[PDB]
Amino acid sequence: DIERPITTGVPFLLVAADARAAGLGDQGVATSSDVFSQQWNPAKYAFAEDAQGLSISYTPYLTDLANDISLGQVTYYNKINDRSAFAGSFRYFGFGGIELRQTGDPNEPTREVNPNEFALDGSYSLKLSETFSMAVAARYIRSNLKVATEEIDASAAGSFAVDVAGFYQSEEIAYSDFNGRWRAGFNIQNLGPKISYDHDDLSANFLPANLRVGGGFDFIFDDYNKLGVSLELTKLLVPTPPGPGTPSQSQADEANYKKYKDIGWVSGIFKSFGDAPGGFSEELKEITYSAAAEYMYQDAFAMRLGYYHESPMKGAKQFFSLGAGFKYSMIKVDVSYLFSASKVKNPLENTLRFSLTFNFGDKYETY
Amino acid sequence: SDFLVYPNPTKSNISFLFDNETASVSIYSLLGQKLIEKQITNQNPVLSVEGLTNGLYFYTFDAGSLHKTGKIIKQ
Protein backbone atom coordinates (compact mmCIF):
# COMPACT_ATOMS: atom_id res chain seq x y z
CA ASP A 1 0.00 0.00 0.00
CA ILE A 2 1.05 3.60 0.63
CA GLU A 3 4.33 4.04 2.54
CA ARG A 4 5.34 7.50 3.81
CA PRO A 5 3.54 9.84 1.38
CA ILE A 6 4.62 13.47 1.23
CA THR A 7 2.85 15.73 3.75
CA THR A 8 1.94 18.99 2.00
CA GLY A 9 -0.51 21.69 3.01
CA VAL A 10 -3.63 22.88 1.17
CA PRO A 11 -4.05 19.66 -0.86
CA PHE A 12 -7.24 20.97 -2.49
CA LEU A 13 -5.02 22.78 -5.00
CA LEU A 14 -4.25 19.39 -6.58
CA VAL A 15 -7.89 18.43 -7.21
CA ALA A 16 -9.21 18.91 -10.73
CA ALA A 17 -11.92 21.57 -10.56
CA ASP A 18 -13.01 21.64 -14.22
CA ALA A 19 -14.99 18.87 -15.88
CA ARG A 20 -12.91 18.83 -19.07
CA ALA A 21 -9.63 17.96 -17.37
CA ALA A 22 -11.39 15.65 -14.91
CA GLY A 23 -12.79 13.81 -17.92
CA LEU A 24 -9.33 13.73 -19.51
CA GLY A 25 -7.93 11.93 -16.46
CA ASP A 26 -7.00 15.05 -14.46
CA GLN A 27 -4.60 16.42 -17.06
CA GLY A 28 -4.79 19.53 -19.21
CA VAL A 29 -1.19 20.71 -19.38
CA ALA A 30 -0.90 19.86 -23.10
CA THR A 31 -4.52 19.74 -24.30
CA SER A 32 -6.05 22.28 -26.66
CA SER A 33 -6.42 25.90 -25.57
CA ASP A 34 -9.18 26.05 -22.98
CA VAL A 35 -10.95 28.52 -20.72
CA PHE A 36 -10.35 26.28 -17.69
CA SER A 37 -6.62 26.22 -18.47
CA GLN A 38 -5.52 28.19 -15.40
CA GLN A 39 -5.05 25.38 -12.89
CA TRP A 40 -3.12 23.27 -15.42
CA ASN A 41 -1.25 25.55 -17.82
CA PRO A 42 -2.02 29.28 -18.12
CA ALA A 43 0.47 29.63 -20.99
CA LYS A 44 -2.13 28.52 -23.56
CA TYR A 45 -4.48 31.41 -22.77
CA ALA A 46 -2.52 33.24 -25.47
CA PHE A 47 -3.76 30.64 -27.98
CA ALA A 48 -7.46 30.97 -27.12
CA GLU A 49 -9.76 31.41 -30.10
CA ASP A 50 -12.31 33.70 -28.43
CA ALA A 51 -11.61 37.19 -27.11
CA GLN A 52 -12.76 36.47 -23.56
CA GLY A 53 -14.52 33.81 -21.53
CA LEU A 54 -16.04 33.01 -18.16
CA SER A 55 -16.35 29.58 -16.57
CA ILE A 56 -18.20 28.08 -13.60
CA SER A 57 -17.24 24.58 -12.46
CA TYR A 58 -18.80 22.42 -9.75
CA THR A 59 -17.34 19.26 -8.19
CA PRO A 60 -19.62 17.76 -5.53
CA TYR A 61 -18.14 15.89 -2.57
CA LEU A 62 -19.73 12.94 -0.77
CA THR A 63 -22.86 13.36 -2.90
CA ASP A 64 -24.71 10.50 -1.19
CA LEU A 65 -24.30 11.88 2.34
CA ALA A 66 -24.26 15.67 2.09
CA ASN A 67 -25.18 18.08 -0.70
CA ASP A 68 -23.20 20.98 0.82
CA ILE A 69 -19.57 19.84 0.50
CA SER A 70 -18.22 20.87 -2.89
CA LEU A 71 -15.36 22.42 -4.85
CA GLY A 72 -16.44 25.33 -7.01
CA GLN A 73 -14.36 27.34 -9.44
CA VAL A 74 -14.91 30.62 -11.27
CA THR A 75 -12.45 31.45 -14.05
CA TYR A 76 -12.28 34.52 -16.30
CA TYR A 77 -9.83 35.02 -19.15
CA ASN A 78 -9.44 37.95 -21.52
CA LYS A 79 -6.86 38.28 -24.29
CA ILE A 80 -6.16 41.88 -25.26
CA ASN A 81 -3.72 41.44 -28.15
CA ASP A 82 -2.88 38.39 -30.24
CA ARG A 83 0.26 37.93 -28.11
CA SER A 84 -0.99 38.21 -24.52
CA ALA A 85 -3.84 37.34 -22.18
CA PHE A 86 -4.86 38.01 -18.58
CA ALA A 87 -6.56 35.27 -16.57
CA GLY A 88 -8.00 35.04 -13.09
CA SER A 89 -9.46 32.07 -11.25
CA PHE A 90 -11.07 31.53 -7.86
CA ARG A 91 -11.31 28.00 -6.46
CA TYR A 92 -13.45 27.57 -3.35
CA PHE A 93 -13.77 24.28 -1.47
CA GLY A 94 -16.57 24.55 1.05
CA PHE A 95 -18.49 22.43 3.53
CA GLY A 96 -21.63 24.52 3.08
CA GLY A 97 -22.74 25.85 6.44
CA ILE A 98 -23.06 24.51 9.98
CA GLU A 99 -25.83 26.32 11.85
CA LEU A 100 -24.59 25.79 15.39
CA ARG A 101 -27.02 26.53 18.23
CA GLN A 102 -27.43 25.54 21.87
CA THR A 103 -31.15 26.07 22.65
CA GLY A 104 -34.44 24.58 21.45
CA ASP A 105 -36.45 27.64 20.33
CA PRO A 106 -36.85 27.83 16.53
CA ASN A 107 -36.13 31.59 16.57
CA GLU A 108 -33.06 32.05 18.78
CA PRO A 109 -29.93 33.41 17.05
CA THR A 110 -27.86 30.68 15.42
CA ARG A 111 -24.17 31.02 14.57
CA GLU A 112 -23.09 29.93 11.10
CA VAL A 113 -19.64 28.43 10.55
CA ASN A 114 -18.47 27.55 7.03
CA PRO A 115 -15.01 25.96 7.14
CA ASN A 116 -13.71 26.72 3.66
CA GLU A 117 -10.53 26.94 1.61
CA PHE A 118 -10.03 29.16 -1.41
CA ALA A 119 -7.25 29.99 -3.84
CA LEU A 120 -7.52 33.21 -5.86
CA ASP A 121 -4.93 33.35 -8.62
CA GLY A 122 -4.16 35.67 -11.51
CA SER A 123 -1.89 34.97 -14.46
CA TYR A 124 -0.37 36.84 -17.38
CA SER A 125 0.48 34.86 -20.52
CA LEU A 126 2.67 36.27 -23.30
CA LYS A 127 3.15 34.58 -26.68
CA LEU A 128 6.89 34.92 -27.27
CA SER A 129 7.12 33.17 -30.64
CA GLU A 130 4.31 32.25 -33.03
CA THR A 131 4.17 28.72 -31.58
CA PHE A 132 5.50 29.18 -28.02
CA SER A 133 4.14 31.13 -25.06
CA MET A 134 5.03 31.64 -21.40
CA ALA A 135 2.92 32.57 -18.39
CA VAL A 136 3.44 33.77 -14.83
CA ALA A 137 0.73 33.38 -12.18
CA ALA A 138 0.45 34.73 -8.64
CA ARG A 139 -1.88 32.88 -6.28
CA TYR A 140 -3.19 33.67 -2.80
CA ILE A 141 -4.28 30.66 -0.75
CA ARG A 142 -6.44 30.92 2.37
CA SER A 143 -7.58 28.07 4.61
CA ASN A 144 -10.38 28.43 7.17
CA LEU A 145 -11.18 24.76 7.78
CA LYS A 146 -11.37 25.19 11.58
CA VAL A 147 -14.28 26.03 13.87
CA ALA A 148 -13.64 28.45 16.72
CA THR A 149 -14.32 27.00 20.16
CA GLU A 150 -12.84 27.45 23.62
CA GLU A 151 -9.05 26.96 23.86
CA ILE A 152 -8.95 26.62 20.03
CA ASP A 153 -8.35 29.42 17.52
CA ALA A 154 -9.87 29.30 14.03
CA SER A 155 -7.75 32.02 12.44
CA ALA A 156 -7.40 31.53 8.69
CA ALA A 157 -3.97 30.51 7.42
CA GLY A 158 -2.76 32.29 4.31
CA SER A 159 0.09 31.97 1.83
CA PHE A 160 1.25 33.02 -1.62
CA ALA A 161 2.41 30.97 -4.60
CA VAL A 162 4.08 31.63 -7.95
CA ASP A 163 3.45 29.49 -11.04
CA VAL A 164 5.66 29.48 -14.15
CA ALA A 165 4.23 27.79 -17.23
CA GLY A 166 5.08 27.31 -20.89
CA PHE A 167 3.03 26.04 -23.83
CA TYR A 168 4.18 25.18 -27.36
CA GLN A 169 1.67 24.50 -30.14
CA SER A 170 3.03 23.68 -33.59
CA GLU A 171 1.28 24.67 -36.79
CA GLU A 172 -0.99 22.22 -38.61
CA ILE A 173 1.47 19.68 -40.03
CA ALA A 174 0.21 17.38 -42.77
CA TYR A 175 1.12 13.69 -42.87
CA SER A 176 0.47 10.73 -45.18
CA ASP A 177 -3.05 10.05 -43.89
CA PHE A 178 -3.97 13.10 -41.78
CA ASN A 179 -2.89 16.63 -40.88
CA GLY A 180 -2.07 16.45 -37.19
CA ARG A 181 -0.86 19.03 -34.70
CA TRP A 182 1.75 18.79 -31.95
CA ARG A 183 1.49 20.35 -28.49
CA ALA A 184 3.77 20.38 -25.46
CA GLY A 185 3.58 22.08 -22.10
CA PHE A 186 5.29 22.43 -18.75
CA ASN A 187 4.07 24.01 -15.54
CA ILE A 188 5.72 24.57 -12.16
CA GLN A 189 3.00 25.35 -9.62
CA ASN A 190 2.74 26.56 -6.04
CA LEU A 191 6.24 27.93 -5.50
CA GLY A 192 5.84 29.85 -2.26
CA PRO A 193 6.54 29.98 1.46
CA LYS A 194 5.28 27.31 3.81
CA ILE A 195 1.69 27.72 4.98
CA SER A 196 1.45 27.65 8.78
CA TYR A 197 -1.89 26.40 10.07
CA ASP A 198 -0.93 27.03 13.71
CA HIS A 199 0.37 30.55 12.90
CA ASP A 200 3.61 29.51 14.60
CA ASP A 201 7.14 29.59 13.23
CA LEU A 202 8.04 25.98 14.06
CA SER A 203 5.01 24.11 12.67
CA ALA A 204 4.73 24.89 8.96
CA ASN A 205 3.58 22.80 6.00
CA PHE A 206 4.95 22.96 2.47
CA LEU A 207 2.82 24.18 -0.39
CA PRO A 208 1.96 21.43 -2.90
CA ALA A 209 4.67 22.46 -5.36
CA ASN A 210 3.95 20.63 -8.59
CA LEU A 211 5.67 19.96 -11.91
CA ARG A 212 3.62 18.92 -14.94
CA VAL A 213 5.16 18.03 -18.31
CA GLY A 214 2.80 16.93 -21.05
CA GLY A 215 2.59 16.38 -24.77
CA GLY A 216 -0.25 15.83 -27.18
CA PHE A 217 -1.07 15.19 -30.82
CA ASP A 218 -4.19 15.94 -32.86
CA PHE A 219 -5.32 13.76 -35.76
CA ILE A 220 -7.56 15.86 -38.02
CA PHE A 221 -10.02 14.18 -40.38
CA ASP A 222 -12.14 16.26 -42.78
CA ASP A 223 -11.13 19.37 -40.74
CA TYR A 224 -14.24 18.83 -38.57
CA ASN A 225 -13.27 15.58 -36.81
CA LYS A 226 -10.47 15.67 -34.25
CA LEU A 227 -8.79 12.99 -32.15
CA GLY A 228 -6.39 14.40 -29.57
CA VAL A 229 -4.12 12.03 -27.66
CA SER A 230 -2.41 13.58 -24.64
CA LEU A 231 0.08 12.24 -22.10
CA GLU A 232 1.12 14.07 -18.93
CA LEU A 233 3.69 13.29 -16.25
CA THR A 234 3.45 14.95 -12.85
CA LYS A 235 5.86 15.15 -9.93
CA LEU A 236 5.81 16.73 -6.47
CA LEU A 237 8.69 19.07 -5.61
CA VAL A 238 8.48 18.50 -1.84
CA PRO A 239 11.02 16.29 -0.01
CA THR A 240 9.64 12.97 1.19
CA PRO A 241 9.88 12.22 4.93
CA PRO A 242 12.29 9.39 5.76
CA GLY A 243 10.91 5.99 6.62
CA PRO A 244 12.45 3.58 9.14
CA GLY A 245 15.42 5.85 9.77
CA THR A 246 18.93 6.94 8.78
CA PRO A 247 20.86 7.15 12.10
CA SER A 248 16.76 3.80 22.00
CA GLN A 249 14.26 3.41 19.16
CA SER A 250 12.11 6.55 19.19
CA GLN A 251 15.31 8.63 19.22
CA ALA A 252 16.13 7.80 15.60
CA ASP A 253 12.54 8.38 14.46
CA GLU A 254 12.33 11.78 16.16
CA ALA A 255 15.78 12.79 14.91
CA ASN A 256 14.96 11.89 11.30
CA TYR A 257 11.58 13.64 11.43
CA LYS A 258 13.16 16.76 12.94
CA LYS A 259 15.88 16.74 10.28
CA TYR A 260 13.26 16.47 7.53
CA LYS A 261 11.03 19.20 8.98
CA ASP A 262 13.93 21.68 9.33
CA ILE A 263 14.24 22.10 5.55
CA GLY A 264 13.31 25.22 3.63
CA TRP A 265 11.19 25.15 0.50
CA VAL A 266 13.93 26.76 -1.61
CA SER A 267 16.33 24.02 -0.53
CA GLY A 268 13.47 21.50 -0.58
CA ILE A 269 13.01 21.95 -4.33
CA PHE A 270 16.57 20.73 -4.95
CA LYS A 271 16.40 18.13 -2.17
CA SER A 272 13.30 16.55 -3.75
CA PHE A 273 15.34 14.47 -6.22
CA GLY A 274 16.66 11.55 -4.20
CA ASP A 275 16.64 11.55 -0.37
CA ALA A 276 15.94 7.80 -0.48
CA PRO A 277 18.11 4.69 -0.03
CA GLY A 278 16.82 3.46 -3.38
CA GLY A 279 18.44 4.11 -6.73
CA PHE A 280 17.33 6.06 -9.78
CA SER A 281 15.01 3.25 -10.89
CA GLU A 282 13.27 3.36 -7.50
CA GLU A 283 13.39 7.17 -7.52
CA LEU A 284 11.53 7.28 -10.86
CA LYS A 285 8.47 5.80 -9.12
CA GLU A 286 7.64 9.28 -7.77
CA ILE A 287 6.23 10.37 -11.16
CA THR A 288 2.51 9.98 -11.78
CA TYR A 289 1.12 9.87 -15.30
CA SER A 290 -2.14 10.28 -17.16
CA ALA A 291 -3.10 9.44 -20.75
CA ALA A 292 -6.24 10.76 -22.42
CA ALA A 293 -7.99 10.71 -25.79
CA GLU A 294 -10.58 13.31 -26.79
CA TYR A 295 -12.77 13.05 -29.90
CA MET A 296 -14.27 16.28 -31.25
CA TYR A 297 -17.09 16.41 -33.81
CA GLN A 298 -18.08 19.66 -35.56
CA ASP A 299 -16.17 21.56 -32.83
CA ALA A 300 -19.39 21.37 -30.79
CA PHE A 301 -19.49 17.79 -29.49
CA ALA A 302 -16.68 16.17 -27.52
CA MET A 303 -16.29 12.70 -26.00
CA ARG A 304 -13.23 12.18 -23.80
CA LEU A 305 -11.63 9.17 -22.14
CA GLY A 306 -8.82 9.41 -19.62
CA TYR A 307 -6.69 7.22 -17.39
CA TYR A 308 -4.81 8.60 -14.38
CA HIS A 309 -2.24 6.53 -12.49
CA GLU A 310 -0.07 7.22 -9.46
CA SER A 311 2.51 5.02 -7.82
CA PRO A 312 1.39 1.99 -5.79
CA MET A 313 3.46 3.09 -2.78
CA LYS A 314 2.31 6.73 -2.64
CA GLY A 315 -0.99 8.44 -3.37
CA ALA A 316 -2.56 5.27 -4.80
CA LYS A 317 -5.16 7.15 -6.85
CA GLN A 318 -5.73 5.38 -10.18
CA PHE A 319 -8.92 5.78 -12.18
CA PHE A 320 -10.62 6.08 -15.56
CA SER A 321 -12.61 9.13 -16.63
CA LEU A 322 -15.42 9.73 -19.10
CA GLY A 323 -16.37 13.20 -20.26
CA ALA A 324 -18.85 14.82 -22.60
CA GLY A 325 -19.00 18.39 -23.87
CA PHE A 326 -21.62 20.26 -25.89
CA LYS A 327 -21.69 23.79 -27.34
CA TYR A 328 -25.12 25.28 -28.05
CA SER A 329 -24.40 28.86 -29.17
CA MET A 330 -21.71 30.27 -26.87
CA ILE A 331 -22.15 28.08 -23.75
CA LYS A 332 -20.08 24.90 -23.48
CA VAL A 333 -21.40 22.34 -20.99
CA ASP A 334 -19.05 19.61 -19.76
CA VAL A 335 -19.90 16.58 -17.63
CA SER A 336 -17.32 14.21 -16.16
CA TYR A 337 -17.58 10.84 -14.43
CA LEU A 338 -14.92 8.77 -12.67
CA PHE A 339 -14.48 4.99 -12.39
CA SER A 340 -12.04 4.18 -9.61
CA ALA A 341 -9.56 1.32 -9.83
CA SER A 342 -7.61 1.71 -6.57
CA LYS A 343 -7.90 -0.13 -3.26
CA VAL A 344 -8.59 3.19 -1.49
CA LYS A 345 -11.96 4.93 -1.63
CA ASN A 346 -11.77 7.95 -3.92
CA PRO A 347 -14.11 10.71 -2.66
CA LEU A 348 -14.87 11.60 -6.30
CA GLU A 349 -16.48 8.23 -7.04
CA ASN A 350 -20.17 8.29 -7.99
CA THR A 351 -19.76 12.03 -8.61
CA LEU A 352 -20.69 13.83 -11.83
CA ARG A 353 -18.52 16.93 -12.17
CA PHE A 354 -20.11 19.82 -14.06
CA SER A 355 -18.71 22.77 -15.97
CA LEU A 356 -20.32 25.67 -17.83
CA THR A 357 -18.24 28.11 -19.87
CA PHE A 358 -19.46 31.22 -21.69
CA ASN A 359 -17.33 32.66 -24.49
CA PHE A 360 -17.80 36.14 -25.91
CA GLY A 361 -15.93 38.76 -27.89
CA ASP A 362 -14.20 38.72 -31.24
CA LYS A 363 -12.95 35.46 -32.75
CA TYR A 364 -9.15 35.22 -32.99
CA GLU A 365 -7.51 32.89 -35.48
CA THR A 366 -5.27 30.06 -34.27
CA TYR A 367 -1.86 29.20 -35.70
CA SER B 1 -40.13 23.41 15.29
CA ASP B 2 -39.62 22.23 11.71
CA PHE B 3 -36.31 20.39 12.20
CA LEU B 4 -33.74 21.18 14.89
CA VAL B 5 -30.52 19.59 16.16
CA TYR B 6 -30.47 21.81 19.20
CA PRO B 7 -26.86 21.34 20.44
CA ASN B 8 -24.81 21.39 17.28
CA PRO B 9 -21.36 21.82 18.94
CA THR B 10 -22.04 19.21 21.60
CA LYS B 11 -20.03 17.19 24.09
CA SER B 12 -23.25 15.22 24.66
CA ASN B 13 -26.25 13.76 22.82
CA ILE B 14 -28.51 15.24 20.12
CA SER B 15 -32.10 16.25 20.84
CA PHE B 16 -33.37 16.18 17.23
CA LEU B 17 -36.63 18.12 17.02
CA PHE B 18 -38.78 17.00 14.08
CA ASP B 19 -42.28 15.87 13.06
CA ASN B 20 -44.21 12.79 14.21
CA GLU B 21 -42.78 10.25 11.75
CA THR B 22 -39.86 8.40 13.31
CA ALA B 23 -36.19 8.85 12.42
CA SER B 24 -33.32 6.77 11.05
CA VAL B 25 -30.37 9.02 11.88
CA SER B 26 -26.80 8.00 11.04
CA ILE B 27 -23.25 9.29 11.43
CA TYR B 28 -20.18 9.04 9.15
CA SER B 29 -18.35 11.85 10.83
CA LEU B 30 -15.24 12.76 8.88
CA LEU B 31 -14.22 10.15 6.32
CA GLY B 32 -16.20 7.41 4.67
CA GLN B 33 -19.06 5.91 6.62
CA LYS B 34 -19.23 4.83 10.28
CA LEU B 35 -23.01 4.42 10.59
CA ILE B 36 -24.42 4.79 14.09
CA GLU B 37 -28.01 4.09 13.00
CA LYS B 38 -30.21 4.77 15.99
CA GLN B 39 -34.01 4.53 15.82
CA ILE B 40 -35.23 7.91 17.08
CA THR B 41 -38.99 7.99 17.67
CA ASN B 42 -41.34 10.97 17.78
CA GLN B 43 -41.11 11.72 21.51
CA ASN B 44 -37.78 10.12 22.50
CA PRO B 45 -35.23 11.93 20.25
CA VAL B 46 -31.93 11.46 22.11
CA LEU B 47 -28.73 10.41 20.34
CA SER B 48 -25.32 9.29 21.61
CA VAL B 49 -22.15 10.87 20.19
CA GLU B 50 -20.53 11.66 23.55
CA GLY B 51 -17.98 8.86 23.29
CA LEU B 52 -16.98 8.42 19.66
CA THR B 53 -14.52 11.26 18.96
CA ASN B 54 -14.39 15.02 18.30
CA GLY B 55 -15.01 16.29 14.78
CA LEU B 56 -17.48 17.57 12.20
CA TYR B 57 -19.92 14.73 11.65
CA PHE B 58 -22.45 14.08 8.89
CA TYR B 59 -25.99 13.09 9.83
CA THR B 60 -28.84 11.94 7.57
CA PHE B 61 -32.11 12.17 9.48
CA ASP B 62 -34.91 10.15 7.85
CA ALA B 63 -38.54 10.92 8.74
CA GLY B 64 -39.85 8.57 6.09
CA SER B 65 -39.78 10.78 3.00
CA LEU B 66 -38.19 13.65 4.99
CA HIS B 67 -34.51 12.95 4.39
CA LYS B 68 -32.79 16.00 5.90
CA THR B 69 -29.01 15.91 6.10
CA GLY B 70 -26.52 18.12 7.87
CA LYS B 71 -23.38 18.45 9.95
CA ILE B 72 -23.03 18.26 13.72
CA ILE B 73 -19.99 19.23 15.79
CA LYS B 74 -18.55 17.07 18.56
CA GLN B 75 -17.39 20.23 20.34
Next chain:
Amino acid sequence: TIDMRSAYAWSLASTPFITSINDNTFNANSNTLEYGFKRAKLSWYTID
Protein backbone atom coordinates in the same frame (compact mmCIF):
# COMPACT_ATOMS: atom_id res chain seq x y z
CA THR C 1 -13.00 7.76 25.38
CA ILE C 2 -14.90 10.58 27.09
CA ASP C 3 -12.65 13.64 27.11
CA MET C 4 -12.24 15.21 30.56
CA ARG C 5 -9.56 17.86 29.93
CA SER C 6 -11.78 20.83 29.10
CA ALA C 7 -10.64 23.67 31.34
CA TYR C 8 -13.93 25.52 31.79
CA ALA C 9 -15.74 22.36 32.94
CA TRP C 10 -13.65 22.13 36.12
CA SER C 11 -14.41 24.19 39.21
CA LEU C 12 -13.04 24.63 42.70
CA ALA C 13 -13.34 21.46 44.76
CA SER C 14 -14.57 20.69 48.25
CA THR C 15 -12.16 19.61 50.95
CA PRO C 16 -11.49 15.88 50.40
CA PHE C 17 -11.16 12.80 52.58
CA ILE C 18 -8.12 10.55 52.26
CA THR C 19 -8.37 7.33 54.25
CA SER C 20 -12.10 7.19 55.05
CA ILE C 21 -15.03 9.33 56.10
CA ASN C 22 -13.45 9.37 59.59
CA ASP C 23 -10.08 10.74 58.39
CA ASN C 24 -9.69 14.42 59.30
CA THR C 25 -6.51 15.01 57.32
CA PHE C 26 -7.53 18.19 55.47
CA ASN C 27 -10.11 19.22 58.11
CA ALA C 28 -12.95 17.93 55.95
CA ASN C 29 -15.07 17.05 59.01
CA SER C 30 -14.94 20.48 60.69
CA ASN C 31 -17.97 22.78 60.57
CA THR C 32 -16.02 26.05 60.86
CA LEU C 33 -13.60 28.07 58.73
CA GLU C 34 -11.02 25.38 59.52
CA TYR C 35 -12.72 23.46 56.71
CA GLY C 36 -10.59 25.60 54.39
CA PHE C 37 -7.33 25.92 56.33
CA LYS C 38 -5.43 23.32 54.26
CA ARG C 39 -6.33 24.67 50.80
CA ALA C 40 -3.28 25.83 48.84
CA LYS C 41 -3.37 27.69 45.55
CA LEU C 42 -4.27 25.78 42.41
CA SER C 43 -4.65 27.21 38.92
CA TRP C 44 -6.12 25.10 36.12
CA TYR C 45 -6.20 26.38 32.56
CA THR C 46 -5.28 25.89 28.92
CA ILE C 47 -2.66 28.33 27.66
CA ASP C 48 -4.35 30.58 25.14
Next chain:
Amino acid sequence: TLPDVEDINRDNTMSTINAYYEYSIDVKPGMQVGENYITDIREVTNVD
Protein backbone atom coordinates in the same frame (compact mmCIF):
# COMPACT_ATOMS: atom_id res chain seq x y z
CA THR D 1 -20.68 34.61 31.91
CA LEU D 2 -22.25 32.23 34.39
CA PRO D 3 -22.61 32.96 38.11
CA ASP D 4 -20.41 30.89 40.38
CA VAL D 5 -22.80 28.43 42.02
CA GLU D 6 -22.32 25.61 44.52
CA ASP D 7 -24.06 23.27 42.08
CA ILE D 8 -21.78 21.58 39.56
CA ASN D 9 -24.13 19.23 37.69
CA ARG D 10 -26.74 21.97 37.08
CA ASP D 11 -29.66 20.09 38.64
CA ASN D 12 -30.48 23.02 40.98
CA THR D 13 -29.67 20.89 44.05
CA MET D 14 -26.53 21.12 46.16
CA SER D 15 -25.37 17.62 47.03
CA THR D 16 -23.76 16.93 50.40
CA ILE D 17 -22.98 13.20 50.21
CA ASN D 18 -19.39 11.91 50.31
CA ALA D 19 -19.63 8.38 48.89
CA TYR D 20 -16.80 7.94 46.40
CA TYR D 21 -13.84 5.81 45.38
CA GLU D 22 -10.30 7.13 45.75
CA TYR D 23 -7.39 6.40 43.40
CA SER D 24 -3.96 7.99 43.49
CA ILE D 25 -0.75 8.26 41.51
CA ASP D 26 2.67 9.28 42.76
CA VAL D 27 4.55 12.13 41.09
CA LYS D 28 8.24 11.33 41.54
CA PRO D 29 11.37 12.01 39.46
CA GLY D 30 12.03 8.37 38.59
CA MET D 31 8.65 7.00 37.54
CA GLN D 32 9.01 3.86 35.41
CA VAL D 33 6.69 1.55 33.50
CA GLY D 34 5.10 -1.38 35.31
CA GLU D 35 4.16 0.43 38.53
CA ASN D 36 2.08 3.39 39.67
CA TYR D 37 -0.36 2.70 36.78
CA ILE D 38 2.32 3.77 34.29
CA THR D 39 1.64 1.82 31.11
CA ASP D 40 3.80 3.72 28.60
CA ILE D 41 6.58 6.30 28.49
CA ARG D 42 7.50 8.31 25.39
CA GLU D 43 10.87 10.06 25.65
CA VAL D 44 11.24 13.05 23.31
CA THR D 45 14.91 13.72 22.65
CA ASN D 46 15.21 17.21 21.14
CA VAL D 47 12.21 19.52 20.66
CA ASP D 48 12.71 22.74 18.72
